[PDB]
């Protein structure tokens, strides 16, 4: 019954969850760029 009311009201039940997993791989990209700095330069220089 929950899916057919969300179908009626045009409510996406996973719009928050699809945007959650799409920013979680987007913040994994900048993390993959951020540790390229610390692997290259080191922890004392970065601090």
């Amino acid at each position: 019954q929950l899916e057919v009311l969300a179908r009626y009201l045009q409510v996406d039940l996973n719009k928050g969850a699809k945007s959650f997993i799409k920013e979680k791989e987007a913040s994994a990209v900048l993390q993959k760029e951020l540790d390229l700095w610390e692997a290259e330069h080191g922890e004392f220089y970065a601090k």
Binding site: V4, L5, R7, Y8
Partner: peptide, 29 residues
């Protein structure tokens, strides 16, 4: 004179349903 004769005798010469179908679409589901 025909007019009088004819007279004498009396023989003269939207979306509401689009809203409705989506209501039955809910109840059919």
């Amino acid at each position: 004179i025909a007019q009088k004769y004819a007279s004498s005798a009396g023989i003269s010469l939207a979306a509401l349903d689009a809203l409705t179908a989506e209501n039955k679409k809910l109840a059919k589901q």
